Each structure stands twice: as structure tokens, then as C-alpha cells.
Amino acid sequence: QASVSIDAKFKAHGKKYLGTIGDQYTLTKNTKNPAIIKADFGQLTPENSMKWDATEPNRGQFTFSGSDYLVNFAQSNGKLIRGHTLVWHSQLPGWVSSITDKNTLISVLKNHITTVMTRYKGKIYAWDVLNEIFNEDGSLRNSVFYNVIGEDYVRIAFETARSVDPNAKLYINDYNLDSAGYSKVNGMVSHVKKWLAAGIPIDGIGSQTHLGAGAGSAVAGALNALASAGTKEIAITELDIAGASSTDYVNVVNACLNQAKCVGITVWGVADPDSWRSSSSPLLFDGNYNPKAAYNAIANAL
Numbered sequence: 001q002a003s004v005s006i007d008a009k010f011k012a013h014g015k016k017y018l019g020t021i022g023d024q025y026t027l028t029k030n031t032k033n034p035a036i037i038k039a040d041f042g043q044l045t046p047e048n049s050m051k052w053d054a055t056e057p058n059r060g061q062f063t064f065s066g067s068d069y070l071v072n073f074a075q076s077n078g079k080l081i082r083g084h085t086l087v088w089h090s091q092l093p094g095w096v097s098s099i100t101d102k103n104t105l106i107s108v109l110k111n112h113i114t115t116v117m118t119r120y121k122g123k124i125y126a127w128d129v130l131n132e133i134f135n136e137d138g139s140l141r142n143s144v145f146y147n148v149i150g151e152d153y154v155r156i157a158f159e160t161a162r163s164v165d166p167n168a169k170l171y172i173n174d175y176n177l178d179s180a181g182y183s184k185v186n187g188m189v190s191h192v193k194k195w196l197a198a199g200i201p202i203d204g205i206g207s208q209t210h211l212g213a214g215a216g217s218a219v220a221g222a223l224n225a226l227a228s229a230g231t232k233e234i235a236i237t238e239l240d241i242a243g244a245s246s247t248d249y250v251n252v253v254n255a256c257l258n259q260a261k262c263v264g265i266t267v268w269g270v271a272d273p274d275s276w277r278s279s280s281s282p283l284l285f286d287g288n289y290n291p292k293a294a295y296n297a298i299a300n301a302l
């Protein structure tokens with residue numbers, strides 16, 4: 001744990017949280033990881049326990065041991081929770097992707113959203129209702145949901161989520177929304193404008209922000225462009241930067257800090273060894289679970 005909590009410092013500026021991710025293994029692999037999370041971050045996103053493959057491995061049969069643990073840990077430690085993720089084409093059981101009947105798929109989709117959301121009803125700050133539904137060019141990704149149900153799945157997902165748990169912020173999450181002008185950013189903005197105008201309950205847009213070195217500076221304008229979609233809020237949801245330079249990190253923190261709609265930042269991991277992009281040492285704590293320069297830089301920028 002670092003003495004100065006960047007979550008405390010971020011919140012000091014009116015932001016909701018500066019969090020990270022977790023699950024059983026990392027929360028218990030050593031003493032430092034859970035200690036870091038408790039002392040320096042104020043929110044948690046399950047790294048894998050709430051995905052479709054881990055919650056409903058078989059049709060109508062749910063497995064919540066993993067998710068229960070992550071939720072219980074966060075609730076027990078005053079950490080906000082972002083559920084992740086209800087509808088995605090990746091980490092999706094073959095039983096789902098094989099459905100060819102529209103109504104059957106809609107029934108399955110609704111039951112999955114309803115069961116998963118109902119279980120943690122009132123404990124989730126935000127839910128990534130839909131994840132990565134766009135092609136890089138801004139067009140809708142032809143996933144089973146899109147192919148079988150069509151664009152109406154977007155409405156179905158959000159409306160269902162909205163009624164099941166009216167207390168959670170409903171988000172659409174995606175990566176590569178890292179620079180204003182980018183095709184995917186334009187596709188996200190235009191589609192959401194249309195969906196909001198249609199009455200689809202989309203409270204926020206989540207920008208993953210999985211960056212390469214030097215891409216930090218463009219994030220500010222990206223956030224500015226996303227803000228034009230007209231959602232209640234937006235957030236940096238899965239932050240990591242190859243090289244983990246202080247400049248890149250401070251640029252990203254400032255990008256959110258200086259944008260009114262950005263409610264928070266979630267770094268995709270605590271320490272490098274546990275990073276899904278570990279070879280690039282993209283996180284704020286090193287292999288010894290000690291703060292890196294970027295962590296301190298961030299604290300000093302706030």
C-alpha cells in the first residue's frame with residue numbers, strides 16, 4: 001500500500017472514484033495486493049467473475065461463487081463496484097452463440113441480465129450492460145446478438161437492465177475510443193445520440209483506454225468527443241499504458257479530471273505481474289507490489 005491514496009485525492013476534486021480490478025486469486029495471492037486495493041483505490045471491477053462464461057456456463061444454470069466473493073469483498077471494504085459485463089461476444093459460452101432463433105435469444109439475454117443483476121441488486125454502482133459492440137469503423141459488430149436479434153438488442157439489453165436494477169448506472173463499454181476523430185469514437189457518439197433520442201436508458205459510456213506508450217495525451221480530446229453523445233456521464237474503465245510512464249498516466253488522469261462528465265477511472269489491475277498485458281508492465285505497482293513513479297506522479301498531479 002502507498003501512503004497517499006490516489007482515490008482520496010481524486011475524489012477530493014469531486015470525482016466518484018479512482019479504482020482497480022480484482023477477484024479471488026489476486027485478492028488473496030499475497031498480503032500487499034488486497035492491502036493496496038483497500039488503501040489506495042475506491043472502486044472495484046471483477047476481472048472475470050461476472051462475465052457470461054463464469055455466471056451462466058449452461059443455459060439457465062448459474063455459478064456465482066466467484067462474483068459473490070468479489071462483491072462481498074468490495075461491500076465489506078467500502079469499495080464501489082462496476083459490474084462487468086452482461087452482454088459481450090467474447091468469453092461467451094457456445095450455447096449462447098449457437099442460438100439462431102431471435103425470440104429464443106431475447107429470452108436468454110433477458111434471463112441472463114435479470115438473474116445476474118437481480119443477485120447484486122442495489123450493490124452495483126454501474127454495469128457494463130454491453131461490451132465492445134463496435135467495429136473499428138464505427139459500424140455495429142456482427143456478434144450473435146447483432147446477427148440474430150439485430151440492432152434492437154441494444155434497446156432490449158438496456159431496458160431490461162433499467163427495470164431490474166434502477167439504481168445502477170447503465171453503461172456501454174468499448175476500447176479504442178482514445179482520440180477524438182477516430183472512426184470508432186464517431187460511431188460510438190452517433191449511435192448513442194440516436195439511442196438516447198429513442199429513449200434507450202444509457203446512463204454512461206465507458207472507455208476502456210488500453211493504451212500504448214505515448215497515447216496518453218490524446219485521451220483528453222477523446223473524452224471531450226464522447227461527452228457530445230449526451231450521456232449523463234462517462235468513465236475510463238480499463239486503464240493500462242505500456243511503459244507506465246508518468247507523463248502518459250498524468251495525461252490520462254488530467255483528461256478525466258478536466259472533463260465534467262468523467263466520473264471516475266478504473267485501472268485494469270494493481271501490479272504488473274497480474275496484468276493481462278504484463279510483458280508491457282502497464283500498471284501502477286511493480287512486480288514487488290510497490291508503487292511505481294507514475295503512481296506518485298498521479299498523486300502529485302492531484
Ligand SMILES: O[C@@H]1[C@@H](O)[C@H](O[C@@H]2CO[C@@H](O[C@@H]3CO[C@@H](O)[C@H](O)[C@H]3O)[C@H](O)[C@H]2O)OC[C@H]1O
Binds near residue numbers: 048
Ligand atoms: O477464464 C480465463 C480468463 O479469465 C482469462 O482472461 C481474461 C480476459 O479478459 C481480461 O479482461 C478483459 C480485458 O479486455 C477487455 O476487452 C475486456 O473488457 C476485459 O473484460 C482479463 O484481464 C483476463 O484475465 O484467461 C482466459 C480464460 O482461460
Ligand SMILES: O[C@@H]1[C@@H](O)[C@@H](O)OC[C@H]1O
Binds near residue numbers: 175176208209210
Ligand atoms: O483495449 C484492449 C486492447 O488491447 C484491444 O486492442 O484488445 C482488447 C481490448 O480490450
